[PDB]
Amino acid sequence: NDDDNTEIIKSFKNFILEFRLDSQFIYRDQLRNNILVKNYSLTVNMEHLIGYNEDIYKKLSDEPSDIIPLFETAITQVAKRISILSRASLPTFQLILNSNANQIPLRDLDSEHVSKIVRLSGIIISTSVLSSRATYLSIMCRNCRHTTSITINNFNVSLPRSCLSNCGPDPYIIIHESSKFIDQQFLKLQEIPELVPVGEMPRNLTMTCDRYLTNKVIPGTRVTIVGIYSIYNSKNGVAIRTPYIKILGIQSDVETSSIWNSVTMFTEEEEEEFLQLSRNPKLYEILTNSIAPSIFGNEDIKKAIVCLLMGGSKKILPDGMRLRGDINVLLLGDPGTAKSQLLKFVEKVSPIAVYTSGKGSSAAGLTASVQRDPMTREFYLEGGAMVLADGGVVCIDEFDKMRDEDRVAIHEAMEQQTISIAKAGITTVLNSRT
Amino acid sequence: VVRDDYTIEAGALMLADNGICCIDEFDKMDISDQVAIHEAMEQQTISIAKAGIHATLNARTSILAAANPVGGRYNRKLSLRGNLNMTAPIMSRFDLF
Amino acid sequence: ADFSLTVLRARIALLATAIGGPDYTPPYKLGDDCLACLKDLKRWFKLVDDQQKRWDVAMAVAEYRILTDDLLPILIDWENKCSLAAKLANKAYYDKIALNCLQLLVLMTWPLIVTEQSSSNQITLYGELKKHQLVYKKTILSMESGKVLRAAIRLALDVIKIDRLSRTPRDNMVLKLVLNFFRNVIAIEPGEFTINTKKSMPKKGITSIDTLPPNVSMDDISLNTVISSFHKNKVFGFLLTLTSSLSDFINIPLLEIMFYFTKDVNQELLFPRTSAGFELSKLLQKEHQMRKNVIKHTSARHSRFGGLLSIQTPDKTRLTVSGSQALVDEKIALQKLDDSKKWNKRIIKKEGLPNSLLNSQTGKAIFFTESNGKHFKEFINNFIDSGFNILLHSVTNYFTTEQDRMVTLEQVEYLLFFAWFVKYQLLRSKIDNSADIKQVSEALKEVTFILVSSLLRSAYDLKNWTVTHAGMIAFNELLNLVSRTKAAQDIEFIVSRLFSDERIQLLSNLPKIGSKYSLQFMKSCIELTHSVLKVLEQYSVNFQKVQANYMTEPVIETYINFLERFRELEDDSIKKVFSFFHRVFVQAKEQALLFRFDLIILLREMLSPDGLDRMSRSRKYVSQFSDYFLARLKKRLKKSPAWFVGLLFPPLHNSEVGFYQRYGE
Amino acid sequence: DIDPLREELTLESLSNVKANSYSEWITQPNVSRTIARELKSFLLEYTDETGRSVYGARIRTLGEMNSESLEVNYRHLAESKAILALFLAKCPEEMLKIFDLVAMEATELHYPDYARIHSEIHVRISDFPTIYSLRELRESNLSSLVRVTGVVTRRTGVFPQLKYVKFNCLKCGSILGPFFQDSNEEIRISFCTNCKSKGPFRVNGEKTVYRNYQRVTLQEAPGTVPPGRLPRHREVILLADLVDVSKPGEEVEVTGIYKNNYDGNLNAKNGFPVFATIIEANSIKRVFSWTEEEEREFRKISRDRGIIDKIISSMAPSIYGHRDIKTAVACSLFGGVPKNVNGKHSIRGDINVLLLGDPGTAKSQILKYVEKTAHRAVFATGQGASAVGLTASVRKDPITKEWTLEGGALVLADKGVCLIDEFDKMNDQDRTSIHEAMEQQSISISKAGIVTTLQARCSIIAAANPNGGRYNSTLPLAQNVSLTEPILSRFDILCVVRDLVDEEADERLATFVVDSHVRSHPENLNARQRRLQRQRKKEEEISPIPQELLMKYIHYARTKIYPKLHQMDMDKVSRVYADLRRESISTGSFPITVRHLESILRIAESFAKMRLSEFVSSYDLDRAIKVVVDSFVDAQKVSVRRQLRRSFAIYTLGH
Amino acid sequence: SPEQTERVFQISFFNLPTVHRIRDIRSEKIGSLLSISGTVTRTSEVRPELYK
DNA sequence: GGGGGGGGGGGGGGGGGGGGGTTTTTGGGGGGGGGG
DNA sequence: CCCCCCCCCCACCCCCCCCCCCCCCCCCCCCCC
Ligand SMILES: Nc1ncnc2c1ncn2[C@@H]1O[C@H](COP(=O)(O)OP(=O)(O)NP(=O)(O)O)[C@@H](O)[C@H]1O
Ligand SMILES: Nc1ncnc2c1ncn2[C@@H]1O[C@H](COP(=O)(O)OP(=O)(O)NP(=O)(O)O)[C@@H](O)[C@H]1O
Ligand SMILES: [Mg+2]
Ligand SMILES: [Mg+2]
Ligand SMILES: [Zn+2]
Ligand SMILES: [Zn+2]
């Protein structure tokens, strides 16, 4: 078996070391450039893997859960060969996959896709904390102190049942000092709204990412995913098991504020395009034309909507006082004056936004709500529309039909940019920059 | 609509399906309480959309109402319309007074 | 390997489709080449199951329902053809398939027996294969009130018509085959739950012995169904006129049929000796006596009330028990302190014949309906009045020969057949003066005594306890009859010299060994002993010389061990035991031999309120015995304090002190 | 005489059942081989009376759809080799096992290498003749095929479930052969066959295979359970192709196997050896589909010059007059074209209608008819509708212990109609929930940490009485009814229904009503065929096209046809809207707004839809203008209605 | 034929001498025949009990 | 002819292995009470 | 009298147990005195 695994590993080593287009060894260069900035991963385009040697892609797509670890191993060996002098240490490199295969919509994924590489898209509705998973367990026997170690690959693992040569019935314990761990995050992906069938409730999948794919995306972002559609045996029918996606690649339509507040991401070409756009003399008129272009007239409202999107400048003073930077606009008036259509456009164009209707809202449902975590039996705080809109806009349509004590709950978050909760023994002032 | 989940508890006009429902002191019933039976009166059904429970329910019922005149005393100088707090939507639903 | 088995079962299923089926134009209709198919199935029985010792065809044929769904329809419709034609008279061909159907019925109903010589496959398949024979018995009796039985007698009448001279060996065989069919249909009985004993028993034993398949009930199999269907098909009339016509190739199966009728039915059940409801009230009162007894053995307050008695003994030491009633009754406290022991002494253990009176539970009655009782009793009455003496003479005139090759089954069924009808006619004659003892006169012809003596002596010498027990039973009824004809009056004097010496010794030695065997073995030993003693007393070579051979401790151990079952014995049996004690103890005055503590305990347990019926005649006899017994024991202890210890032990066979222990000077 | 692995029997032998039980007979291999040939012969040689093999055509279609399911009609099996039909009823678990293999063989014969597309076929039995209610299930139904009706009360997610599973023994040679997983019990391995001993076990890693799974709670339909009694229910299990063929609140008819199993929980809490039970589904039904000939019939009748009028006359045929209401209902029920301008601006296609008027004028009956006729429909009278019961609600999930959404009526009827009878009786907090779903065609809940927007693509038709119970033609509309302008403007056709005494009109209406009552009396070639023929004879007296045809025609026109505007009389619609706006300055009048301008276009598109015409003609637009102008004019008080109708006549009486 | 199973027989007694109330339950009457009256406050689903 | 010794079966005890072990917030409906 | 508000109720070691194995005890049979 390990002879064949060695041949697979050598085949991938050759793919990294030999693949070349227009005089550039793109994977050698990418691996080196990643090593210098100390991200130990490689992004592979499966078009290139198919083009190199379609037998390799056949092995990978037949059984990715066995072949992806071997590819990662190959990447480690090349990483050492191109960044450490041979005969004068690095972790196991994550493999990230880019693909243009035909997507399966989230609702169509089923038993025929188990253990296959799958491509899909949706909106991330939740992101859990960074749990820790072992890559390498240092192990020893509780009685005779036989010491060994278990390398782990996270594609579906256990300790051994009895000692590897009396030691008692269940003999092994972990040694955490010499064991190694990685970040693991859970995301919940909900299917695209315009792809939901007629009269159906929108379906969602739990899915996991690890190493450098953690914290890459945040709730509300629309994403496309490459991953192994796979199963886990929950503690809860008969012979029934929970589906999930082991993520191998994430590609958001755009990246915004995922784990960054002062950091940014812009290319030189788009920065220069924005710079020469900023210098245009008719810029305000062009932006006003861009707002809701199929809505006639309402020019001062469109001008105000540009101002609301842009916002002012937030300020913090030696007093300690904070001055509100964002802008609030109310459209009050007659029926069919395109107010709701304008709110729809603003929710569509803003980089961060939420749309709610006042009669569909709640005080908690808007600012933030207390929840009880069921198996912990303990209270925690979950964000409402103001939290999800933080750093952007909340479009409160149908505002006059909001119940008054729901309406009053907006006051602090609307002026002080904060939500002062005091409930169930929780006391916090969450930020809401909306 | 009650918990046990959300589910439907049969009222009087459900229990008298293929039957007779007798409402005493009908006139004292609030208009909010009166207008609820306009469907069971004539369409022979009750339709509900509440709390995630949606149904239409059979109320094939002959209703017998025992209204008082307004002020108790029946004023013989006034119309039957004038002697009651009912109005044409529900009076047209009765076969006879 | 099991591939051969699925090939076999496939073949039998295809054959099952070839026999025939219903026709919608409902009537059953034979298949094309039906005679060849029936012949091939008979071939399968011989070819595989007999010659290879398997019973796989016998299982597969039950799986594909050939008997119930083809052969009985064929026979019943053929019977209808012949019976409808008989009022009006290609039958010459259909007669052949009717005969071959009866051959197949005799095969599939053949009485299964398992022994050490049976193959591994046979002993494996035995338990489930029996169940299908029970289904066959149900269907044969029930279907159209059992008109197949009328088909069988018609097949027999079609040789009885041609003369005793005319009947060829094939005709004789066909008649014998019909008798085997009747015998088999009587003989099927539920199998025994044969547990494997390699692995130890769990904390709960076997859940139930019931072996009947789910479409059968024991009432379907009961004698009531047999008697009803046989009456409604006049099988009894056929058998009666057949034995009337005995003037012998078929005599063994006819004997065997009468055995299989009689083997498990008690004679007194056929005689009375609102009435059912009145007797139900009597039964309810009898168990209400047990209720007023167990009530005194029950706490007047709840179980957790738990007041503690302490028994201080005659010495300076104390025991403790929680019995709330026992606080006021040391009798209860003592026997509870005894029952509290976790210890029990370990106890010891201990086929080619059916169950019978030889081995049933001692009170196991057959619950006739009144009509079935009438039909059965009148049938066996007419048999006694016609067929008994000739049939017994026929079979005993055989059985004097070939005793060496008489298989054990044949021996036991013969002895039981003799005994049952002798006992019955004695009872019917004790009831009705119109019934004659001489109507069973063949029992007393000396050839019969010689044969039954030979069977008993040989079985005892050969240590065949089964035939020994049956011959003992036969001796009991022979002596019963002999005593009656002694009163009715030469043959009595003749046998009363022939049972001298070796026969005295043998009969004396049965109840020496009997204590080791089942309750029915002991019961037959006691019954024989009482019959022997009353016969010898009626004669009264010397009386003391014979009875001294009985009055010894192994016989007393048999008597005590039999009497341990007193709650489950019948009152007459307790009377018989206590009449034996009356002779031995009061009259023969070997009273030392009964001063032993096993009897003392047994006397108290039956004289206790938890023992015998307060109004029982046997209770009166035990009380009458016990007063005199206690008086004599009191006297002997006053004359011998050594006997306070001697009471615990076997008496001393060292005669030099043994005589002094026995009589005390 | 015969090879034992190929011994086989005649059909009369199969009727001559002679095992102890049906299942023992089906599994007897000579019988099993014969049954295989029998069902194969049925699928080959059973024909329609046109001589076509039905199952030839269905297998052809199955492969064209790449389906795993073959629809078999039970009655076709009762019509030929009926012993197989009896076996199928009495012993479906074995018989379907054989019939599936036969169906796979038949399609592999018809489509070679269909094993590459699906390795297995499931015969989905339909038209099983005998039906039970969930109250009516009993012990005698156990392991029988049953046909049951109910409402899907609670649908769980779609899961993979093991189908064929090998196991590993940790002792000896590990791998154990593939067990087939059922719907009720885990595989129990009492001992390992390879070492004939107990042991621990794990699912094998070398190979295992999965099938889709989904439980459904099926409950007594609320009108079918007798009053006072509680609704009974059973768990239904959907496997493979059947998952998500239904959604919560839908009434369904289920064909399946009523099975049971030991469950220590049921025994534990009840104290008797009493078993849990399910229905393992083999078919699910919700009537609005069509055949190629039915499609041709729609195409044929669509050519008729009077087809819009024949449709309109056919709307609610047993209601006299009210041709304006029938037009409004027709326009609503066909609907406009929903549009999306480069993805940057989405526009409502649904047409909302308000039936405002006097008592005893068939408004509720019209709404009940529309509930009868529309392909997705929901009905909720007045005080019976809460705000969240109309749009959507959040509940603390009882088994998941978390918040989840529950779709209201406007979710259930998405791409359909919602029917609010006695609309004026609603509480205003309930009424104002309608707004977002009624114009933006969505519901945006934000509650309990849930934040999302649902689709609510409904045409809402509502029926109301005026204030005080009766209309007043000396008052303008806003004084006749308490509804505010933002909700009135969303109902973009208004029909005002006045009950006036008028001698010959009442004569004609009363004549029609008494004729309808005798024409509806219950007492008023086989008998069933004759009765259906008599029903058609009765129906053609009042419906110019068959109602059964009209439902499928509506569904066809809705799903296939999307009329474009072209050659537009832009100046005419502009002048119509400009004049409607000017004359609507009357303070109480029907509040003309831009959504009414778009309503003209929706209505014209719906009329082109009625013709199955992918372009809107001038006739469609002119009829739309006539409807909208008449709806506006009709709402005006008598003091001005003649002058306004005369003024507007130039746009409408030119048609 | 396939073996149409043994029929079970329910022996439904009625018209007893007296009616006991729910409060009159007393454990000497375990195993005895009674008639009982009350009002049905709830009912189970009808289920199969394993008998034989 | 009875008692001792040898041999076989059956039962019991001990050891070893294995498996099991409520208040607080949010939303919704319905009922009751107060103000114009 | 009607409508709106607001109030209420509801969702890893230790013990018990079971299985397996070994030895001892009790009975039966055969031989010897
Ligand atoms: N100026 C306009 N240009 C284009 N379309 C318009 C304009 N005004 C209204 N509409 C159309 O009319 C509808 C406007 O609906 P909407 O956006 O809800 O208006 P609104 O101001 O929110 N009225 P309301 O929700 O009752 O207060 C949409 O179908 C628009 O396409
Ligand atoms: N034009 C008509 N043709 C036939 N039946 C009619 C007509 N108008 C009224 N009816 C009958 O009137 C009865 C009541 O109809 P319904 O639909 O309840 O009227 P409505 O408009 O809803 N009145 P209301 O509920 O008080 O607002 C039904 O049984 C109809 O058959
Ligand atoms: Mg709006
Ligand atoms: Mg109405
Ligand atoms: Zn160890
Ligand atoms: Zn194993």
Numbering used by the authors:
A (entry chain 5): 20 to 107, 131 to 198, 205 to 213, 235 to 305, 320 to 517
B (entry chain 6): 612 to 615, 620 to 712
C (entry chain X): 13 to 37, 43 to 106, 117 to 274, 280 to 305, 329 to 405, 412 to 550, 556 to 606, 657 to 781
D (entry chain 2): 173 to 458, 473 to 710, 738 to 868
E (entry chain 6): 255 to 306
Quote the passages of the study that discuss this structure, keeping the authors' original sentences.
Upon termination, the replisome is disassembled in two steps: first, CMG is ubiquitylated on its Mcm7 subunit by a cullin-RING E3 ubiquitin ligase (SCFDia2 in budding yeast, CUL2LRR1 in metazoa); second, ubiquitylated Mcm7 is unfolded by the Cdc48 ATPase (also known as p97 in higher eukaryotes), leading to disassembly of the replisome. Despite being driven by evolutionarily diverse E3 ubiquitin ligases in different eukaryotes (SCFDia2 in budding yeast, CUL2LRR1 in metazoa), replisome disassembly is governed by a common regulatory principle, in which ubiquitylation of CMG is suppressed before replication termination, to prevent replication fork collapse. Our structures show that the leucine-rich repeat domains of Dia2 and LRR1 are structurally distinct, but bind to a common site on CMG, including the MCM3 and MCM5 zinc-finger domains. The LRR–MCM interaction is essential for replisome disassembly and, crucially, is occluded by the excluded DNA strand at replication forks, establishing the structural basis for the suppression of CMG ubiquitylation before termination.
Nonetheless, we identified a subset of particles, which was subsequently subclassified into two conformations (conformations I and II), that had unambiguously translocated onto dsDNA, representative of bona fide termination intermediates produced after fork convergence. While the configuration of the MCM C-tier differed between conformations I and II, in both cases the incoming dsDNA was bent by approximately 46° between the MCM N-tier and C-tier, necessitating distortion of the DNA duplex within the N-tier. Having identified particles that had translocated onto dsDNA, we were able to build an atomic model of a terminated replisome. We observed an additional, large region of density at the N-tier face of CMG beside Mcm3 and Mcm7, which closely approaches Csm3 and the dsDNA ahead of CMG, before extending away from the core of the complex, forming an elongated arm characteristic of the cullin subunit (Cdc53) of SCFDia2. Density corresponding to the E3 ligase substrate-recognition module (Skp1–Dia2) is adjacent to the N-tier face of CMG. However, clearsecondary structure and side chain density enabled us to build a de novo atomic model for the remainder of Dia2, encompassing the F-box (residues 211–247), 15 tandem leucine-rich repeats (LRRs) (248–716) and a C-terminal tail (717–732), which folds back onto the concave surface of the horseshoe-shaped LRRs. The C-terminal end of the LRR domain forms an extensive interface with the N-tier of the Mcm3, Mcm5 and Mcm7 subunits of CMG (see text below for a detailed description), demonstrating that Dia2 binds directly to CMG bound around dsDNA, equivalent to the situation after convergence of two replication forks. The extensive interface between Dia2LRR and MCM is predominantly formed by the Mcm3 N-tier (helices α1 and α5 and the zinc-finger (ZnF) domain), which forms a cradle for the C terminus of Dia2LRR.
